[PDB]
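lol so apparently i was supposed to do this last week
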Amino acid sequence: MNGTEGPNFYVPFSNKTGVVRSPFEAPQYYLAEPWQFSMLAAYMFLLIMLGFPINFLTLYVTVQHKKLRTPLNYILLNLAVADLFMVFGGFTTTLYTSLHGYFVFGPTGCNLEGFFATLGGEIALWSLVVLAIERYVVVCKPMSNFRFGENHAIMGVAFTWVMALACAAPPLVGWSRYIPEGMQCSCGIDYYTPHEETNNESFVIYMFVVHFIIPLIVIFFCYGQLVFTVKEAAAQQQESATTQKAEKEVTRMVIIMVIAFLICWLPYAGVAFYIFTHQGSDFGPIFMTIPAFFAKTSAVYNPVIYIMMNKQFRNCMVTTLCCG
Amino acid sequence: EVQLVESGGGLVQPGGSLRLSCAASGFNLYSSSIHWVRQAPGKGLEWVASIYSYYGSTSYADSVKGRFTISADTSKNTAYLQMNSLRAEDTAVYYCARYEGWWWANTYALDYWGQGTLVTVSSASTKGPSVFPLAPSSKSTSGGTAALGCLVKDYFPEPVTVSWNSGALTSGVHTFPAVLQSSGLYSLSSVVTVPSSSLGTQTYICNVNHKPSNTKVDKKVEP
Amino acid sequence: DIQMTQSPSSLSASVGDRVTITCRASQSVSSAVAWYQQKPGKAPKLLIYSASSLYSGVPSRFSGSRSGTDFTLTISSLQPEDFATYYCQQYYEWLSLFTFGQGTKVEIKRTVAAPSVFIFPPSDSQLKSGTASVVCLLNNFYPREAKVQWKVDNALQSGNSQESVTEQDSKDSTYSLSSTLTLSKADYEKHKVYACEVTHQGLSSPVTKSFNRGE
Amino acid sequence: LETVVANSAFIAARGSFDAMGEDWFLDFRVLGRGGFGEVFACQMKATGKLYACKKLNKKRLKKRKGYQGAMVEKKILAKVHSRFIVSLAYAFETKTDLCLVMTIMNGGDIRYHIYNVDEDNPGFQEPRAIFYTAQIVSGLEHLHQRNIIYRDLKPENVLLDDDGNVRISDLGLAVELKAGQTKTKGYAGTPGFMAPELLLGEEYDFSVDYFALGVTLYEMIAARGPFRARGEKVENKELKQRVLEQAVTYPDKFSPASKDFCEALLQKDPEKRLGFRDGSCDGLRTHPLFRDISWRQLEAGMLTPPFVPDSRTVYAKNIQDVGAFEEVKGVAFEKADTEFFQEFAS
Ligand SMILES: NC(=O)c1cn([C@@H]2O[C@H](CO)[C@@H](O)[C@H]2O)c2ncnc(N)c12
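anyway here it is w/ sangivamycin bound
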């Protein structure tokens, strides 16, 4: 094996306590401790407490500032909604379950919770891609000189939903499956079990290529072009402090934007790839919570990067904070 | 208030030249236009010339145009009128006046004037008066009142004063305005109506003083 | 050119009267009329400026109305210092002169009075200079609808006679006129009858006072 | 931030330029939010030339019911041109705005330049201001000779080109009259650039445009209007009271010639206001302010401006606080509105 395989579970811990079965009815305390569950619940509490205000504000501020209602912000509103799907579908459920020490909603519950978490995370993932595309479109020009209009924005939003369903829907129909990850109180994607009945191998290749590599490439292209353009512009305009500052700032920002995509999805991709390439790769249950930590925190940092560091939103937020 | 005090008048020969000065106060000269206006004695007012507020544009009445040149110094706050070519009609009291703005500027009008400075254009030296009695008539006796007087003739320049009995008789005394004769000398008559009956009972003496030579002649006018 | 007319040319008024005078410009100089009062021993003084707007530090007795080419100055109640000459001005150029009226004389209304006519012999002293001056006094008459005429030997003397007229007296408020006929000594000694003929409306027909040389 | 990226892209576009629809214009930052919508810079796909696009947002139009105001500004600016009135090049719509795309003036607007020179330097230096005043006057004169009452003029509508010559631009709420009328009633134009006559609901002639000039000139030199403070604008009701009641006081920043000229324009009665004096508007031209500038050379554009806008810097605001007005909630467009949008477009 490489842990303890099941047809409806994957305990990452190797069987050696002789009670490693499905954790839909078995309380995990033979591979975890109560304090680790408190820290799990604490972490989920954090993500709710930060995630809900931040994302609610993003929707709210646009409704009360006229000037914010523009096509290029639609995708940002979508991002905030995506993050909230992760908060109420994933985080809250996992907080509840962790205090029992196992997932108490059963196989159907696992599929539901796992679906909402994946759906959320995928709309977020693809939002970051679409956003990079939109930035490329506006500055680099898809077809020489283009206005970004309502229709394109809507298409962009719809696209993230469709791609997300393209990922979240397959484990419900038996091509892969949702089964507990981490300390067995959240459900993730089956990628860590070499289990024939769900055809994990082909799914892992599909996942890695279409939902990581493609996005990663698109991001590198778009922002590479953008940083190039801004460097060039500054070079052709030595005069004025502003253009020189802009060049430095844009390079810094692009590094932040690339890194944020990396942190969020690289752990999942890395771990999945390693297990695929090398059989008998045992990673503990606590160890399997690590990719989730990195991914889940993007529900906070994505809106910091993509909303706050945009001039228009900033002004409006300042207005609202100074009474409004 | 705003005030203008002129100086620089005097007697000047015909066809000569004279420069009048108008000292301005109560305002900054560079912030107000300045003009000259003149008044012939006992007549209307003729505008002479203007020069712009910050100085640059000039206008002139046609009769004086070119001949008189308006000017000013904003470093003295004084306006000057340089008068070249003098004529008999130029004999006048000369006024400076003020004006504000130029080309519609709260639709101004000439708001402050000087008290005038006398310019006399004439040729002749100062001359004491010859005083002749104007004897009463014995044919004016017909009303019981006779008028007698003195003709104060061939003096230059003005003013003479004529009084009767050293100023003791001044009621019924009509001292007429000086008239400029065609000899270029002034003449006036001063007359008094008295009872015809009081002639040769009261003597009537005209006391003539001509201040610009300090010449005084007292002439007893016969009964 | 710019021609300023006023009407009435002269008017007889009394204190506490409503005096209305008009001014007319020959061409339109827009609403642009100042009214000045001038009276002896003073410099011109602004009454009304702009078009009808009362100037600061001027009594509200003076007021103006109207616009166009016909301007009005009204004095609601007269005071004893409003017997004066009133001038309108228009204060514009194209480079044309700033044009003033010919003055409207407001004078003191009173009864007609006949002149006391006196004719004066020259003295011996006057004849010694080489000129003979014969003086005629018309004393205390009103109004100035009077003409003095000199006749020497019935021949009309004009262009060698000079008139001078005083304004309203403070002793009786009338006018006096002295006319001095200046002749050669030679002309005087070739003449005999020197006559001053006085024409006035208070007189039924001209009164002539004459003398024969000396007393 | 992103606005700086857009500003950098503008700089990039300018460099290319120096050296009709949604697939025909590259969009850069907005430069302000006007009366009916935002006004952003933009660039031609096939020409690589910079144009301003005065957007009148459809949503904001519906809210304000600003359909009349839009048509007036269009038709007037479209028809009347000189060398002191810029051309209109295109009138199209996208899907969210009506567009007027007008000819180059990459030098910014006069209002910007008041504060960009330095904000501790109020307006321009006297010779530079005088030159621009002379040029504005010539543009107004051209309108008056065609018997056009503008009812407007403002610093933000006086644009600098890169030469440094100024031109009036964007002919808003106005009426072009024929020969045989000069007096018309109405309430029109943007408050503060409207004379007493309009505000009181009375007939007015050419005088009112000269009132607007007075306001413009005063703001150009002193960095504040006669009826507003420095970089401020007051509410319409208060502004109306200011125009009718507030006497103008003159800083020492003005030269004597410029003081006198401003006084002449800012009189509240048309009769006392310099402009049309019932036989010419060339009586205005006689004022000593213009002794510095020959009229013959000025009208033919043969005079060099004492400032030349640099092309290594870009004028006009980059978004950081621009105005706003409602965009639609439940409010759904009328059939009439759709017909207006097509009709507006040429
Ligand atoms: N409507 C116009 O003609 C223009 C207005 N602006 C800017 O857009 C801002 C908002 O109106 C103004 O303050 C100017 O900075 C312009 N900037 C450049 N060119 C133009 N044609 C205009």
